[PDB]
Design a binder for these strands. Structure first.
Ligand SMILES: C[C@H](O)CN1C(=O)c2c3c(c(O)c(=O)n2[C@@]12CC[C@H]1C[C@H]12)C(=O)N(Cc1ccc(F)c(Cl)c1)CC3
Ligand SMILES: C[C@H](O)CN1C(=O)c2c3c(c(O)c(=O)n2[C@@]12CC[C@H]1C[C@H]12)C(=O)N(Cc1ccc(F)c(Cl)c1)CC3
Ligand SMILES: [Mg+2]
Ligand SMILES: [Mg+2]
Ligand SMILES: [Mg+2]
Ligand SMILES: [Mg+2]
Ligand SMILES: [Mg+2]
Ligand SMILES: [Mg+2]
Ligand SMILES: [Zn+2]
Ligand SMILES: [Zn+2]
Lengths: 184, 368, 368, 184
DNA sequence: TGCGAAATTCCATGACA
DNA sequence: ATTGTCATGGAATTTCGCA
DNA sequence: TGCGAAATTCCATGACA
DNA sequence: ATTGTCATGGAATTTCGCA
């Protein structure tokens, strides 16, 4: 059995609805299975149209052999199925109510969700501009299991933005009370 | 100098006047019978005016000015006096063309790693497509991997918006660009400082300096042209197709595509290379690190028979950027302050400004 | 052809397939273990589609199309099939650039006598001066003697008015001009017929053909530029001065001025040559007849390493005159009807029109 | 004494007033002394201004060493004298009431005056357009004394317009009566 | 140990307006 | 305070298939 | 029958937009 | 159914002035 490679499988999913930022309410998350590299795309809805518009930007850089997602409406539509067939992409779904990906991916989506929550507190309407810095953070994040960051695994070089200052990701008592204040 | 001419009439030798000739007086002027015919020897005090009068008829060069003078006069080392006048004619120096080619081009070393240096430029105006008129082209120097962005103008604002999308992947050490308004703005310098990005600028009006991106502009336009044959020029929806197409095209000299140099593996695109299938990603990245260092590098071509190379202190002239109708194509002489390399130079004009220019936009001032 | 591939699987030799290789079946397709790796051998009936698919990704040339195909397949003489596709891609043939230079230029013999051939052309639009915007330049081919006329437009009417003034001196046998509206009109043809003047036209969009007058345009503009340094561009009153100045300027290679070749004697201008003072006008005209025949004539330069020369029946392509943005720079292939000389040719396009064109505006169609 | 050459002496004079043709009433006549070559310039007046405007066109082709004329106002003015001095042209005048030029020139001016009179009859208002053909005629006219035409003597070549069809120059009885008819 | 043909490499040409 | 580039298709050269 | 310097010739460069 | 041209100023080569 052939060793795992980048572009072998992309794990897609939607984060949201989030507070409106520049008219956007959702984030489509794309994680390469092998390297753990993340691409984030803000959408106005978790629709096939928005998924297709976003993935058309990503697939202009690299095309995955397989796309993996849950049974969300946007991914199970015949339109999204037509889009994939055109690009020679095999669609793959996890069992309804039983979402499975991989240890590396499951952990990556946790960091994504946590990092987003951490920066949403204080500026919940300014996340559109933060998406580039969130991705550089995520992609220059050292992997305990592999010894290398997703940037290193994808390009085979060190980065010009090393995120050596490994932060908390957990909320401070001040951020915690400020977060529950927004929940009103 | 009618004193110098007096000793000559007597018959005694003066340095410069051949003794074998017959110097006489006629019509109140010193004459000489030379093979060509009988010419007048004007006093040294009159020669400058004669040379200036001959030259001013059609602002003629060396031989054409001489041929006129020689019709009436003779004096020792006439061309020495002709060249003195040519070197002082401001009209000739700023209007005449150069006849010395630039030295051979440099072939800068290829950036070592992807993201070391980006080359950026604008294409347009193009026929309007979805309200868009321009294309921002971003070329990674090492790989040749290109990113395309449709814009409504070649503005700092549209460059920043596009680059904020690109830099979500990786941040470059340097961004090389020409001196277009979009990239020389303070807003763009601020945007780069904020990100640790060094801005490097080409010498002005020398697009060969941005050669890497310029060349990619040719392929982008050539492919858009082909795809749009017998259809309206709706290029906006083709940018993604063109980008993916070119990033996955072989360079026959390298035997690699820009995608392969960036990732060391083809994605799910047609005719994907399968040679590293049994290698682990680490074995694959090891081979990619080796491929990236062993790429062919061209060398400087031979100098042309009549090339010139800059020297510190040399009187040189910068080419007028947008010369108006019936106006000189050259600026007044400048002095070469520093020679950055054989093709780049720092000059000081008559104003007193320091300018980093390409030798392609310079001519060495004639007649010293 | 799955029949051809069957005999191969059995183990018996087919011309083109090396016997030393191991041909097998796997995943329902004929494979071969080649040094590069294991490639699929598609049936002959499938190859055209594969080549077309590989080529169509970025409309790539020979090696770049091959390198893609070679990633998955192998078959005998792949490039032969690649070249067949390249030669049938209308988009590539009309968009790609040539890589064969034209043959060496011709140096037409200098007209024997003054008034044998005139070269005419327009300069402009120039900054408005006294309501005038253009200059009609008339160059006698033999002498180089020029006549300048300010005009409000490059019109047939202004050409006729100017030439009626010029032809009061002498009538030319031929008038050579480019294909500018002013000279191709029926009114201009009528004007020439009436006077026994033969109109000769340059091949279109090839100003080198009018080289004689074009070159004089450079001197006229260069001199006007110098005289107008630091003054408003009031050129109208300088045309007479420029005309007289240039007509009396030495050509260093000939050692004669256009005035001298026309009259055999300088008029009362500064630095007039006095060498024929003791000769009678007849002795003077005898020497002029000798000078006119012994003038230096340049010869065709060496051909470049990769030049092409036209052949009758050859598939050739004319350059698009004013190509629009994102549109091909070349017309569809044409056939060479007659080769007038190595630099001029008669072609028949797909419409069926006969066109006399310069090889500088042609490329030979690639891949036969 | 050096042999006679072209541009050594130009003989100038005015013909008119003639019937108005294209607003013009006079013809300035310039004859090269040596070759007998003729240049004709239509003017609106026999003034220094018109002489200078016309001679500025001629002197852009060739400058004479000497200009010869009678004591006409236009040629004796200090303005015309300033114009000549600027171009290094020596002015020369014939004695008042005693016009002298040369045999060749005197004969040339006769042919000019006669040829003009011959073509004026019938079309007296169309002479402006005929000036070019009148000059080609005059300049391609064989010289009995020299064996060559003024064109041959000036350029040292035969012309492309030989005026072999040597016409009358004298008026026909029909032209004679038609000429006296205009005199009304 | 060498032949004919195919495959590969060379490289001038031209365009980024 | 910077610097030309590289797709292209005939020609030249090398390698392949076979002996 | 030859030297040093001046004179002449050669010729690549670039522009006619 | 026509076709490149030639001013320019350093370099290369020839000629001049003298012996
Ligand atoms: C005022 C005027 O607009 C100035 N200008 C250009 O002319 C121009 C060019 C180009 C640019 O990119 C470009 O930015 N500009 C700018 C300067 C900065 C911005 C105002 C624009 C350009 O690419 N080309 C094509 C070309 C031609 C020859 C070559 F050798 C190469 Cl490598 C490319 C040459 C013209
Ligand atoms: C529609 C468009 O205007 C077409 N066009 C030209 O572009 C043009 C040129 C010239 C003309 O005389 C001329 O007439 N035209 C016309 C064609 C007929 C009339 C509409 C005008 C011209 O001289 N140049 C400069 C040039 C450039 C390179 C050279 F090698 C030489 Cl020798 C000269 C080149 C541009
Ligand atoms: Mg989910
Ligand atoms: Mg630019
Ligand atoms: Mg550019
Ligand atoms: Mg023209
Ligand atoms: Mg022209
Ligand atoms: Mg009189
Ligand atoms: Zn000058
Ligand atoms: Zn194609």
């Amino acid at each position: 059995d052939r060793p795992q490679k980048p572009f072998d499988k992309f794990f897609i999913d939607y984060i949201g609805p989030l507070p409106p930022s520049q008219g956007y309410l959702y984030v489509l998350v794309v994680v390469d299975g092998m390297t753990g590299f993340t691409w984030l795309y803000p959408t106005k809805a978790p629709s096939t149209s928005a998924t297709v518009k976003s993935l058309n930007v990503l697939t202009s850089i690299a095309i995955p052999k397989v796309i993996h997602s849950d049974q969300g409406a946007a991914f199970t539509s015949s339109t999204f199925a037509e889009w994939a067939k055109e690009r020679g992409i095999h669609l793959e779904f996890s069992t309804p109510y039983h979402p499975q990906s991989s240890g590396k991916v499951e952990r990556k989506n946790s960091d994504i969700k946590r990092l987003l929550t951490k920066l949403l507190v204080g500026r919940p309407t300014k996340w559109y501009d933060l998406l580039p810095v969130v991705q550089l953070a995520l992609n220059n994040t050292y992997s305990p299991v592999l010894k290398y960051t997703p940037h290193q695994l994808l390009f085979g070089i060190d980065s010009n933005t090393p995120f050596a200052n490994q932060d908390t990701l957990d909320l401070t008592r001040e951020e915690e009370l400020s977060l529950l204040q927004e929940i009103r | 100098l009618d004193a110098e001419l007096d000793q000559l009439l007597q018959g005694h030798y003066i340095k410069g006047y051949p003794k074998q000739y017959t110097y006489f007086l006629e019509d109140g002027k010193v004459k000489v019978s030379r093979p060509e015919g009988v010419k007048i020897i004007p006093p040294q005090s009159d020669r400058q005016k004669i040379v200036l009068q001959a030259h001013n008829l059609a602002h003629t060069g060396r031989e054409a000015t001489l041929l006129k003078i020689a019709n009436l006069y003779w004096w020792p080392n006439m061309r020495k006096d002709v060249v003195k006048q040519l070197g002082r004619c401001q009209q000739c120096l700023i209007t005449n063309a150069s006849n010395k080619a630039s030295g051979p081009i440099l072939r800068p070393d290829r950036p070592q790693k992807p993201f070391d240096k980006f080359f950026i430029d604008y294409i347009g105006p193009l026929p309007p497509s979805q309200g868009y008129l321009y294309v921002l082209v971003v070329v990674d120097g090492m790989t040749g991997f290109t990113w395309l962005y449709p814009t409504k103008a070649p503005s700092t604002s549209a460059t920043v918006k596009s680059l904020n999308v690109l830099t979500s992947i990786a941040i470059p050490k340097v961004i090389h660009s020409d001196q277009g308004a979009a990239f020389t703005s303070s807003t763009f310098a601020e945007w780069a400082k904020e990100r640790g990005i060094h801005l490097e600028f080409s010498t002005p009006y020398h697009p060969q300096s941005s050669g890497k991106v310029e060349r990619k502009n040719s392929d982008i336009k050539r492919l858009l042209t082909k795809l749009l044959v017998g259809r309206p020029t709706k290029w906006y929806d083709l940018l993604p197709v063109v980008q993916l197409a070119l990033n996955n095209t072989y360079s026959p000299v390298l035997k690699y595509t820009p995608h392969q140099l960036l990732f060391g593996i083809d994605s799910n695109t047609p005719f994907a290379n399968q040679d590293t299938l049994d290698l682990t990603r680490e074995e694959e990245l090891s081979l990619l690190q080796e491929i990236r260092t062993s790429l062919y590098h061209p060398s400087t071509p031979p100098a042309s028979s009549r090339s010139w190379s800059p020297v510190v202190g040399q009187l040189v002239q910068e080419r007028v950027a947008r010369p108006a109708s019936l106006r000189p194509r050259w600026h007044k002489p400048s002095t070469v302050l520093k020679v950055l390399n054989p093709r780049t130079v720092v000059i000081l004009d008559h104003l007193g400004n320091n300018r980093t220019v390409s030798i392609d936009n310079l001519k060495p001032t004639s007649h010293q």
